[PDB]
Amino acid sequence: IKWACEYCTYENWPSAIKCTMCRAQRP
Amino acid sequence: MQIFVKTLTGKTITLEVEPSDTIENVKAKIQDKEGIPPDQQRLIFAGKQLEDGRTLSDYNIQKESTLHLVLRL
Ligand SMILES: [Zn+2]
């Protein structure tokens, strides 16, 4: 279910619309 | 928006967060200010525990709301 950030590769929750670590917008 | 996190010691942290932010994300912001890592953080609002996967909007946490931080559960 979790999505990997394109930039920092951190795995975020489905509910999130931005990376928790780098705060990049979700694709 | 702006919210407050009350520690067990008595300290009150102030966080700038948006309602779209996940509880996990809030814990990351608490790590930034207080140096405690998210695995140890437990956030309590309205007498219940808040899941890392859900947003602040899901729990009806609004401007000026106060959450309680607990460590290691
Ligand atoms: Zn990232």
Residue numbers in the entry:
A (entry chain G): 6 to 32
B (entry chain A): 1 to 73
Paper text:
To understand the structural basis of selective interaction between TRABID NZF1 and K29 chains, we determined the structure of TRABID NZF1 in complex with K29-linked diUb. TRABID NZF1 crystallized as a stoichiometric complex with K29 dimers, and the ASU contains five Ub and five NZF molecules. The Ub moieties are arranged in such a way that the C terminus of one Ub points toward K29 of the next to form a continuous polyUb chain, and each NZF recognizes one diUb. The four cysteine residues of TRABID NZF1, C10, C13, C24, and C27, coordinate a zinc ion. The NZF domain of TRABID interacts with the I44-centered hydrophobic patch on the distal Ub. Thus in the NZF1 of TRABID, residues T14, Y15, and M26 interact with the distal Ub, and these residues are conserved in evolution. In contrast to other NZF domains, TRABID NZF1 does not make contacts with either the I44 or F4 hydrophobic patches on the proximal Ub. Instead, TRABID NZF1 recognizes residues around K29 in the proximal Ub. The overall conformation and relative orientation of the distal and proximal Ub moieties of the K29-linked diUb bound to TRABID NZF1 are considerably different from that of free K29-linked diUb. When superposed on the distal Ub, the proximal Ub of the complex is rotated by 45° and moved by around 20 Å, thus remodeling the K29 chain.
Polyubiquitin chains regulate diverse cellular processes through the ability of ubiquitin to form chains of eight different linkage types. Homotypic Ub polymers of eight different linkage types can be assembled in which the C terminus of a distal Ub is attached to one of the seven lysine residues (K6, K11, K27, K29, K33, K48, and K63) or to the N-terminal M1 of the proximal Ub. Of the atypical linkages, K29 polyUb is the most abundant in resting mammalian cells (Dammer et al., 2011). Our work shows that K29-linked polyUb adopt an open conformation and are recognized by the NZF domains of TRABID and has revealed the use of NZF1 of TRABID as a tool to study K29-linked polyUb in cells.
